[PDB]
């Protein structure tokens with residue numbers, strides 16, 4: 001009758017810490033999961049103290065998730081290999097820029113039948129086209145992979161406000177097991193099988209949200225923001241269908257990972273906040289990230305840069321106006337006030 005699976009949370013930021021509240025509590029409540037939940041924490045010096053000691057002592061990662069405690073059973077562990085050594089389930093939740101290295105170090109040190117689920121929002125590019133982050137993680141570490149994507153602003157999740165998420169998993173058994181580990185009476189999960197489409201949604205919505213922030217930065221309102229979300233979704237489906245392997249069904253975009261995450265993000269996401277300030281101050285995105293997010297990371301612009309690269313290697317840049325408009329305003333120096341023009345001209349269908 002099975003042993004309890006050990007869970008390792010790789011990452012500890014805003015979303016990561018919020019996910020630890022959920023997981024820490026479920027592992028502690030459910031026999032199937034070992035109560036000892038480890039969390040890899042990239043060590044930091046917070047006023048002389050090591051962040052890993054603060055967490056294991058005060059059970060709170062206030063720098064990244066203020067006003068919330070973490071279940072006492074979540075252990076902070078600075079060495080990622082150690083944190084992951086005995087894990088059966090590995091939740092990958094860290095900003096895009098950091099997984100490669102993490103994977104460099106875990107390769108070959110994971111338990112035999114370990115599996116993983118990625119919560120990361122973004123995309124890489126492969127020797128030939130789009131390469132999903134879960135695929136990258138899955139191939140380097142040699143483990144089966146799932147993805148958890150939905151409209152989940154962390155602060156709200158941490159506050160237990162009602163919300164849902166989508167888990168993409170090909171294996172039914174695993175799909176249900178991961179759902180038992182993540183579901184809360186306020187964190188409702190639907191499991192679907194096209195991992196790819198679900199993941200890509202999480203990645204592309206952040207680019208759209210940068211655009212929404214620009215329009216807020218130009219003084220627009222809801223009718224405009226809705227347009228931006230609608231046109232962004234039109235580009236997302238079209239883009240998913242072109243570059244994703246296997247069938248891409250529009251129905252999947254009606255899941256939380258799609259229309260919902262696109263909405264919540266465009267209204268209260270970090271990408272929207274920094275995007276608006278970019279529109280108002282003219283400062284660099286990098287500078288705004290440092291000045292405004294107290295250490296948290298942006299994914300929207302870097303993702304747009306990735307899209308640019310994927311699209312240009314196929315001379316299809318002219319095909320995704322809204323996406324490319326976000327990229328040009330962030331990186332080429334195109335005046336933000338010109339953003340509206342890409343909406344006014346946007347193709348009616350794609």
Ligand SMILES: NC(=O)c1ccc[n+]([C@@H]2O[C@H](COP(=O)([O-])OP(=O)(O)OC[C@H]3O[C@@H](n4cnc5c(N)ncnc54)[C@H](O)[C@@H]3O)[C@@H](O)[C@H]2O)c1
Nearest residue numbers: 012013014015016042093094095120121152153154296297
């Ligand atoms: N925050 C959210 O609301 C929310 C909701 C759903 C998905 N996500 C996604 O979750 C993923 C994880 O993001 P997050 O929000 O937990 O974090 P952050 O984006 O909150 O924090 C940056 C984090 O990265 C780490 N970091 C900084 N420099 C590092 C380095 N040099 N090496 C290794 N780590 C370093 C720190 O440990 C810190 O916790 C992201 O892809 C994001 O888009 C976030």
